[PDB]
Every structure is written in C-alpha cells, then in structure tokens.
Design brief:
The structure is cut from a larger assembly and holds three copies of chain A. Chain A has 24 residues and is low in regular secondary structure. Chain A is built from no helices and one strand. Chains in contact: A-B, A-C, B-C. The complex binds a molecule of 2 linked components (NAG-BMA) and 2-acetamido-2-deoxy-beta-D-glucopyranose (NAG). Residues 21-23 of chain C line the site of a molecule of 2 linked components (NAG-BMA). The PDB classes it as viral protein/hydrolase.
C-alpha cells in the first residue's frame, strides 16, 4: 500500500532546457 | 582545416568565421555554445 | 521484488532564472 503525506519541493526539479553550453 | 577564414556549414549552421582550438569545458551532452547576446560562439566538431 | 520514495510532481509552464557556473553546471535557480 501507500500513504499520501505532503511535503515541499524547495529548490528542486530543474533540468537543462536546451543543449547550449553557457558560462558566467 | 583551421587558422583561416573559411565558409563553414556546421550541421546546418551557415556562416563565416576563423576556426581554431579552444579550452572550453563542453559537457558530454552539449553541442553549441552561445553568449549573453545569443550568438553562436563555439561549436563542438561532430566528427572530431 | 524482495524477500522514502515516490515524490511525484507535475510540471507547468513557468519562467525560471538559472545561474550557470563558469563550467556550464547549474549551481542555482530562482522561480519567477
Ligand atoms: C571547470 O573545469 C576545469 C577543468 O576540468 C577545472 O579546472 C581544474 O580544477 C581542478 C581543481 O578544481 C584542478 O585539480 C585541475 O588541475 C584543473 O585545474 C575547474 O576548476 C572547473 N571549474 C569549476 C568546477 O568551477
Ligand atoms: C565517424 O565514422 C567513422 C567510420 O565509422 C569513424 O572512423 C570515426 O571515428 C567516426 N567519428 C566519430 C567522431 O564518431
């Protein structure tokens, strides 16, 4: 089975949008 | 060929520019390289 | 099979501001 407790994501879940190298 | 003004057509990116060696840190999934003002800066050679 | 997980989230169209290191790594992000 499972529970349905709720938590916060905070600063999370961010991937690279495109394939362009970027610096500074 | 490097170190000369040469008409390039890298993977559909047409333009004219001097090509040479660089010391970027292109990560394994990266192909292009751009600037703050969004100009194609460094291109990872597909066959090199 | 055997003899603290399942953190599911849904994505939405949002503007994000990301800080890229000098090496292309994403060290920080702030929502908008
Ligand atoms: C970006 O990547 C560079 C090359 O991989 C890093 O330079 C290296 O730095 C390490 C120590 O951090 C040295 O041991 C190595 O000889 C080389 O100089 C550079 O630090 C890195 N920049 C980051 C992670 O911000
Ligand atoms: C391109 O293909 C040739 C023939 O298989 C191979 O010798 C060469 O190393 C390849 N280049 C890259 C960068 O994969």
């Amino acid at each position: 089975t499972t529970t349905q407790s709720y938590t916060n994501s905070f600063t999370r879940g961010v991937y690279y949008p495109d394939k362009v190298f970027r610096s500074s | 060929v490097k170190n000369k003004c040469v008409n390039f057509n890298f993977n559909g990116l047409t333009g004219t520019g001097v090509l040479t060696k660089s010391n970027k840190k292109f990560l394994p999934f990266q192909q292009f390289g751009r600037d703050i003002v969004d100009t194609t800066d460094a291109v990872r050679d597909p066959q090199t | 099979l055997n003899r603290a997980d399942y953190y599911v989230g849904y994505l939405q169209p949002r503007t994000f501001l990301l800080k890229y290191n000098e090496n292309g790594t994403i060290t920080d992000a702030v929502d908008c």
